[PDB]
């Protein structure tokens, strides 16, 4: 591809932003899902409001232009939602604009054409009636999987953006279920939760990276995906999260050896809701949320500005995989403690998902 280099960093710089604010919760989101959502939204913005968004995603408009970025995002977004694509990954965008605006046509047009997104006008006057239409709009277009999302709306809201994404993959080489069994997972030096622990002795592209001071495991997905797990040495969690860099993962990936290992990957299902305004705000993206907001590409009547931007992602990890099938002690590698992981898109290498698991039970 050609944006992986930047989304990769966006992914990271986005991560150390949500992690900074609560090193006690699980963290899970799709860097691509979001960039896509703002790259999409950028379509209806102009001037600085516009350039500030694409830059905020680590793009340098003077060394590459939009009419190529949008090109790249769409090439990737296809890969995922594609036809044969049985990777089981759903994702979309909701756009709620205050009813009473002659919204430019072309916009809605492009939006629901390339960036898989739908627009719905609502009555922001009634703080509760909008809350209602929305929570319900979402619960309908989400197949009833996301309920009562928006807990509480604002008062002067006039534009709201909801971005979602569910994912549950099957591995190339699956785990027998008769083998998984409950085990201790040390979330803290004091707390300990019991959790189902999938286990399998196999040939892995696992290796103990000294630079990151942590075991790094690679697990291929059935499809155009790949998951990389990082198990950090005692108290090296913080370090790991600090020394991570695209150039490093990139190298790891390149290598092609493989050695015996006894894996203890935990069976888990986690999600993560986040309010982007604040975070992206820290990452440079402000105008679209401020007052000047140049959203002329969306409406030409009154002023307008993104008031709320929410992101919900859901992941499920299990033993599922392709239906099918005393001489050198292999290293035991048990993920029974906080660990960081990242999902890559096989073709483009872009960062599909990113997270930390601090408690397999927490929600």
What CATH number corresponds to the domain at position 38? 3.30.497.10
Q: Measure the CA–CA gap between 260 and 202, rounded to whole angstroms.
A: 6
| Contact between residue 106 and residue 43 where contact means Cβ atoms under 8 Å apart | no
Asked whether residue 128 falls in the same domain as residue 252, the answer is: no
Q: Measure the CA–CA gap between 173 and 217, rounded to whole angstroms.
A: 14
CATH number at residue 223: 2.30.39.10
Q: Measure the CA–CA gap between 231 and 334, rounded to whole angstroms.
A: 9
Q: Measure the CA–CA gap between 217 and 231, rounded to whole angstroms.
A: 8
Asked whether residue 142 falls in the same domain as residue 177, the answer is: no
Asked whether residue 70 falls in the same domain as residue 199, the answer is: no
Determine what percent of the chain falls in helix, strand and coil, rounding each to the nearest 5: 30, 30, 45
- The burial class, CB within 10 Å (0-12 / 13-18 / 19+), for 260 is middle
- Residues composing the chain: 363
Asked whether residue 205 falls in the same domain as residue 219, the answer is: yes
Asked whether residue 72 falls in the same domain as residue 111, the answer is: yes
What the block records as the tokens of 191 is: 């707390």
Asked whether residue 29 falls in the same domain as residue 114, the answer is: yes
Q: Measure the CA–CA gap between 215 and 209, rounded to whole angstroms.
A: 6
Please tell me what resolution, in angstroms, this structure has. Answer: 3.2
- The count of other CB atoms within 10 Å of the CB of residue 249 is 22
- The burial class, CB within 10 Å (0-12 / 13-18 / 19+), for 328 is exposed
| Contact between residue 314 and residue 167 where contact means Cβ atoms under 8 Å apart | yes
What the block records as the tokens of 38 is: 């703002």
**Angle, vertex CA 77, rays to CA 74 and CA 79, nearest 5:** 115
Q: Phi and psi at residue 278, in whole multiples of 5°?
A: -50, -65
Asked whether residue 179 falls in the same domain as residue 157, the answer is: no
Residues 6+ apart with CB under 8 A from 75: 1, 348
Q: 260 - beta bridge partners?
A: 203
Asked whether residue 252 falls in the same domain as residue 295, the answer is: no
Cα-Cα-Cα-Cα dihedral sign, residues 140, 142, 143, 146? negative
What the block records as the tokens of 137 is: 């709009």
What the block records as the tokens of 112 is: 């629901």
Q: Which residue has the tokens 């090439």?
A: 75
Cα-Cα-Cα-Cα dihedral sign, residues 104, 109, 115, 118? positive
Asked whether residue 220 falls in the same domain as residue 108, the answer is: no
* Count: domains in the chain: 2
- For the chain, breaks with the C atom over 2.5 A from the next N come after 325
Q: Phi and psi at residue 129, in whole multiples of 5°?
A: -65, -30
DSSP letters spanning 224-258:
S-EEEEEEE-TT-HHHHHHH--HHHHHHHHH----
Asked whether residue 261 falls in the same domain as residue 150, the answer is: no
Q: How far apart are the first and last CA of the chain?
A: 35
Asked whether residue 260 falls in the same domain as residue 273, the answer is: no
223: left (phi over 0), alpha (psi -120 to 50) or beta: left
Asked whether residue 331 falls in the same domain as residue 213, the answer is: yes
Q: Which residue has the tokens 């809201």?
A: 157
Which residue range is the domain that position 74 belongs to? Answer: 1-171+267-320
């Amino acid at each position: 591809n050609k944006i992986t280099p930047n989304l990769a960093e966006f992914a990271f710089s986005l991560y150390r932003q949500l992690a900074h604010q609560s090193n006690s919760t699980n963290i899970f989101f799709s860097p691509v899902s979001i960039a896509t959502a703002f790259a999409m939204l950028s379509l209806g913005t102009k001037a600085d409001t516009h350039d500030e968004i694409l830059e905020g995603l680590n793009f340098n408009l003077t060394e590459i232009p939009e009419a190529q970025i949008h090109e790249g995002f769409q090439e990737l977004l296809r890969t995922l939602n594609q036809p044969d694509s049985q990777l089981q990954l759903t994702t979309g965008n909701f756009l709620f604009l205050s009813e009473g605006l002659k919204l430019v046509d072309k916009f809605l047009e492009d939006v629901k054409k390339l960036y898989h997104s739908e627009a719905f006008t609502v009555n922001f006057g009634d703080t509760e009636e909008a809350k209602k239409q929305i929570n319900d709009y979402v619960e309908k277009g989400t197949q009833g999987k996301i309920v009562d999302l928006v807990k509480e709306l604002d008062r002067d809201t006039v534009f709201a953006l909801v971005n979602y994404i569910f994912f549950k993959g099957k591995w190339e080489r699956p785990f027998e279920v008769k083998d998984t069994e409950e085990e201790d997972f040390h979330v803290d030096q004091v707390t300990t939760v019991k959790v189902p622990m999938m286990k399998r002795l196999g040939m892995f592209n696992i290796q103990h990276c000294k630079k990151l001071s942590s075991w790094v495991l690679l697990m291929k997905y059935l499809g155009n995906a790949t998951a990389i797990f990082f198990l950090p040495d005692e108290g090296k969690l913080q370090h790991l999260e600090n020394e991570l860099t695209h150039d490093i993962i990139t190298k790891f990936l390149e290598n092609e050896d493989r050695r015996s290992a006894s894996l203890h990957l935990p069976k888990l299902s986690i999600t993560g809701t986040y309010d982007l305004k604040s975070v992206l705000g820290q990452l440079g993206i402000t105008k679209v949320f401020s007052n000047g907001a140049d959203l002329s590409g969306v409406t030409e009547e009154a002023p307008l500005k993104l008031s709320k931007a929410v992101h919900k992602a859901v992941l499920t990890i299990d033993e599922k995989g392709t239906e099918a099938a005393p001489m050198s002690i292999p290293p035991e590698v048990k993920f029974n403690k906080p660990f960081v992981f990242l999902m890559i898109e096989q073709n483009t290498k872009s960062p599909l998902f990113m997270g930390k698991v601090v408690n397999p039970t927490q929600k």
